[PDB]
């Protein structure tokens, strides 16, 4: 029942500054060193800095000295990190972590996605991945939706309003040249299901306030 | 002090004994080394730190040891939930510094599975917008390594494709999207992805003809 509740996802233009927060509950906040760690897409953990329990003392990773500020608010039990001169390389999930007395991080926040891009918020276009003989291999067929040209992450994709989970696989988004994300959400189905079962991918993109649904029907090829 | 983990990917079966290695650039003390587990889409979780001190509630199958520059995390019997990425972490107090290894993926070992190679021609809704994405889909293959070569009128096509690989049945799927302007799309006829994988004795090519097959 340690809670480290981080501020919500942020989108930033390059050269901007960001301030991320982590609200502690369930423990005596002022007894713990707090740390910030970031993780860029499909990369590893990287330490950024720590702040002592009083808020008087900080230490930053050498790669972030000058561009990162750590603060904590004893009154609100809230850890803050501010980071400046953002570049797209700072696109990452930022984690607060509570340090155990041993020096290891025993409890982590849920993380804060910070996306740094010159791209502007944009809803996805959702294109059917139309199943056919070309997406059919002996009893198994694949269909899907191409959820394309959105920004920022994330999108949420369901099939048939959640009723369809079997065979569903939404791929990790790829960042395109355009600075926009695209993903493919695929359903492996019985070939017998083509043309008898209805397949609708439901796409919610909260950052752009967009919802898309795409019925996916077979092509004849 | 930097930490380097090995192997980058460890492939084992549930119930196996896993040993993950963390190599420090210089001698460090085990008491200042911690091990974390991270599943996709989740925050890391501390497993073990120091001389095999397990974090609160970490089962006894997790242990750690080592000295000098050589440290190991051992999972004596892999559970399905143990297949994840593992990070070592080193810390020092003067001055305060933390560093992580680059992570070791613990993957489910399984038999080589050739991908089913599916191809999706551009939708008319996309073509209406002035763009054509052709999607090559490699389904349920193993191991992860795969090569997709796009071909346009049997020329090697590059520069405008990206792929996404899923996480680990225990197989992988990979989508490769070739994205063209409609104009470029209409300048050629045959669109194909040629796929290379350990389970394929020869490259598999899936193709269509624009407007047809």
């Amino acid at each position: 029942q340690v809670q480290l509740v981080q501020s919500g996802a942020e989108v930033k233009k390059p050269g901007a500054s960001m301030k991320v927060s982590c609200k502690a509950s369930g423990f005596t906040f002022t007894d713990y060193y707090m740390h910030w760690v970031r993780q860029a897409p499909r990369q590893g953990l990287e330490w950024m800095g720590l702040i002592n329990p009083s808020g008087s003392g900080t230490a930053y990773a050498q790669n972030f000295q000058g561009r990162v500020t750590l603060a904590r608010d004893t009154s609100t039990s809230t850890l803050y990190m501010e980071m400046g001169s953002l570049t797209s390389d700072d696109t990452a999930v930022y984690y607060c972590a509570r340090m155990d007395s041993s020096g290891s991080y025993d409890h982590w926040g849920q993380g804060t996605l910070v996306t740094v891009s010159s791209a502007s918020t944009k809803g996805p276009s959702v294109f059917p991945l139309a199943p056919s003989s070309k997406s059919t291999s002996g009893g198994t067929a694949a269909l899907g939706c191409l959820v394309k040209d959105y920004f920022p992450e994330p999108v949420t994709v369901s099939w048939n309003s959640g009723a369809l989970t079997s065979g569903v696989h939404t791929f990790p988004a790829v960042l395109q040249s355009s600075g926009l994300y695209s993903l493919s959400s695929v359903v492996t189905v019985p070939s017998s299901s083509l043309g008898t079962q209805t397949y609708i991918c439901n796409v919610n993109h909260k950052p752009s306030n967009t919802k898309v649904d795409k019925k996916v029907e077979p092509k004849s090829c | 002090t930097t930490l380097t983990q090995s192997p980058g990917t460890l492939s084992l079966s549930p119930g196996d004994r896993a040993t993950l290695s963390c190599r420090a650039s210089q001698t460090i003390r085990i008491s200042y080394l911690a091990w974390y587990q991270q599943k996709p889409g989740q925050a890391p979780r501390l497993l073990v730190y120091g001389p095999s001190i397990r974090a609160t509630g970490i089962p006894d199958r997790f242990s750690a040891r080592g000295s000098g520059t050589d440290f190991t995390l051992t999972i004596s019997r892999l559970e399905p939930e143990d297949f994840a990425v593992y990070y070592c972490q080193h810390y020092g107090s003067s001055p305060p510094r933390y560093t992580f290894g680059q992570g070791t993926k613990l993957e489910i070992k399984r038999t080589v599975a050739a991908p089913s190679v599916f191809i999706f021609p551009p939708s008319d809704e996309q073509l209406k917008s002035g763009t054509a994405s052709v999607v090559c889909l490699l389904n349920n293959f193993y191991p992860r390594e795969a090569k997709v070569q796009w071909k346009v009128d049997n020329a090697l096509q590059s520069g405008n494709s990206q792929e996404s690989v899923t996480e680990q049945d225990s197989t992988y799927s990979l989508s490769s999207t070739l994205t063209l302007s409609k104009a470029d799309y209409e300048k050629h006829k045959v669109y194909a992805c040629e796929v290379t994988h350990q389970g394929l004795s020869s490259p598999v090519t899936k193709s269509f003809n624009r407007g047809e097959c």
Binding site: N52, G57, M99, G103 | Y32, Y91, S93, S94
Partner: peptide, 12 residues
């Protein structure tokens, strides 16, 4: 232990 080490660093 390590918390006390960081305490000692920051006191200095």
């Amino acid at each position: 232990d390590f918390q006390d080490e960081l305490d000692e660093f920051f006191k200095n």
